């Protein structure tokens, strides 16, 4: 229908509010990420890691040194890279949670339901925003200061050689939608307010917030993408694809968390690296 009625102005105002929260909560947006991947930005080119020799030069640019070099160099590299991917994941939760609080009505929910929505929703947000940082060659790492190639990640040890491939194959199909930060801001909020998470108390207040986010998203996509019909429908299938692809990812590293013995990082040691930095 698309009318210029007072309810549409509220859906446009909600999109503006979610976008402003998207900028403050997340440092590296897709707008700046694409500027680095194409060299359009005035900043310096990021350090590129494509082989083992380039990775050794990258570690020398880090203040930390890792004073426990295990003999297995195939494990010294794979395990070290994976824990860098996990320490960054923890800081993303701090940013995701900061953005989740900005969604109208989220704080008014039950506190245990807020945990449940973030519990199962953090992974699906990571999969989405990670696509903004990667292309067909590699992924931007360390707040855009680095760039690790895709084929280098495939050259790691056999268990760690394909934990990023399910994310690259999703990105090439998700970036084809060519969404911008304005579209992603609403789309992230829709994933959080998914009212069918296992263990939700009152589903009624959650889906009521999501239905306004869904209406604000379809209005955003129809206005921002004039040459793309059914883009709202295509994006819903990408959301359901995140469901069955995250369950395969969470079950994948549970084998690593158990068979590597040193993967479940010590809780008190985590907080030391966060507060020092
Ligand atoms: C492998 C890898 C990936 C895929 N990424 C991007 C990434 C990951 C996870 C999420 Cl969730 C994510 O999501 C986006 C949307 C976001 O949040 O930007 C984006 C990395 C970022 C930094 C480092 C690293 O190793 N960096 C060095 C500088 C360091 C960091 C920390 C340490 C200590 C453990 C000692 C503290 C030591 C060295 C490695 C990776
Ligand atoms: C020094 C260091 C430490 C202490 N950790 C945590 C860590 C290591 C090893 C084990 Cl085993 C571990 O687990 C338990 C058992 C433990 O020993 O504490 C925990 C790191 C993780 C990743 C990188 C890295 O080199 N990340 C690469 C991807 C990059 C990223 C970004 C850059 C630039 C910023 C220059 C762009 C350069 C290189 C370095 C370190």
Kindly list the domain boundaries of the chain, sorted by start residue. 1-277
Instruction: Name the 3-class secondary structure at 267.
Output: helix
Which distant-in-sequence residues (6+ apart) come within 8 Å of 166 by Cβ?
245, 248, 249
Asked whether the beta carbons of 173 and 61 are under 8 A apart, the reply is: no
Cα–Cα distances in Å, from 148 out to 140, 161, 239? 7, 13, 26
What's the CA gap between 183 and 175, in Å, rounded? 12
Q: How far apart are the first and last CA of the chain?
A: 52
Whether the CB of 58 sits within 6 Å of ligand 1 = no
81 CA distance to ligand 1 middle (Å): 9
Q: Would you call 212 exposed, middle or buried from its count of C-beta atoms within 10 A (0-12, 13-18, 19+)? A: middle
**DSSP 3-state assignment of 217?**
helix
- Residue linked to tokens 């280098």: 152
Place of tokens 């998207």: 22
Which ligand has an atom closest to residue 59 CA? Answer: 2
Ligand nearest to the CA of 64: 2
CA of 235 to the centre of ligand 1 (A): 27
Is 123 marked within a binding site?
A: yes
Question: CA 126 to CA 106: how far, in whole Å?
Answer: 19
Tokens 């203040």 locate to 63
The pair of three-digit structure tokens given for residue 101, joined into one six-digit string:
């609080």
Residue nearest to atom 9 of ligand 2 (CA): 80
SS3 141: strand
Q: Which atom of ligand 2 is nearest to the CA of 64?
A: 1
Query: Which H or E run includes 25?
Result: helix 6-25
Would you say 163 and 82 are in contact if contact means Cβ atoms under 8 Å apart? yes
Rounded distance between C-alpha atoms, residue 257 and residue 60, angstroms: 28
Mutate-to-test residue for ligand 1 from 29, 32, 85, highest number of ligand atoms within 8 A of CB: 85
Q: Quick check: 238 and 172 in contact, CB under 8 A?
A: no
CB 200 near ligand 1, within 6 Å: no
Closest alpha carbon to 215 in 241, 237, 193 = 193
**Residue 259 neighbours by CB under 8 Å, 6+ apart:** 159
CB 141 within 8 Å of CB 25: no
Closest ligand to C-alpha of residue 92 is 1
Structure tokens at 6: 């007072």
User: If DSSP codes are grouped into helix, strand and coil, which group holds residue 47?
Assistant: strand
What 3-state DSSP class applies to 44?
A: coil
225 annotated ligand binder: no
CA geometry: angle 222, 228, 233, nearest 5 deg: 75
Q: How many residues does the chain have?
A: 277
């Amino acid at each position: 229908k698309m009318q210029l009625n007072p309810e549409s102005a509220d859906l446009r105002a909600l999109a503006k509010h979610l976008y402003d929260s998207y900028i403050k909560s997340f440092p590296l947006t897709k707008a700046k990420a694409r500027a680095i991947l194409t060299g359009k930005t005035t900043d310096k080119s990021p350090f590129v890691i494509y082989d083992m020799n380039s990775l050794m030069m990258g570690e020398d640019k880090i203040k930390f040194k890792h004073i426990t070099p295990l003999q297995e160099q195939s494990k010294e590299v794979a395990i070290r890279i994976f824990q860098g991917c996990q320490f960054r994941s923890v800081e993303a939760v701090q940013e995701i949670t900061e953005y989740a609080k900005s969604i109208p009505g989220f704080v008014n929910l039950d506190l245990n339901d807020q945990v449940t929505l973030l519990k199962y929703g953090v992974h699906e947000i990571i999969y989405t925003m990670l696509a903004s940082l990667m292309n067909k060659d590699g992924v931007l790492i360390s707040e855009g200061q680095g760039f690790m190639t895709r084929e280098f990640l495939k050259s790691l040890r056999k268990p760690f050689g394909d934990f990023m491939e399910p994310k690259f194959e999703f990105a090439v199909k998700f970036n084809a939608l060519e969404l911008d930060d304005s579209d992603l801001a609403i789309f992230i909020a829709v994933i959080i307010l998914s009212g069918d998470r296992p263990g939700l108390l009152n589903v009624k207040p959650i889906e009521d917030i999501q239905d306004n986010l869904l209406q604000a998203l379809e209005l955003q996509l129809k206005l921002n993408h004039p040459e793309s019909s059914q883009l709202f429908a295509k994006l819903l299938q990408k959301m359901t694809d995140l469901r069955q692809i995250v369950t395969e990812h969470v079950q994948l590293l549970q084998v690593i968390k158990k068979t590597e013995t040193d993967m479940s990082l010590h809780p008190l040691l985590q907080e030391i690296y966060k507060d020092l930095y």
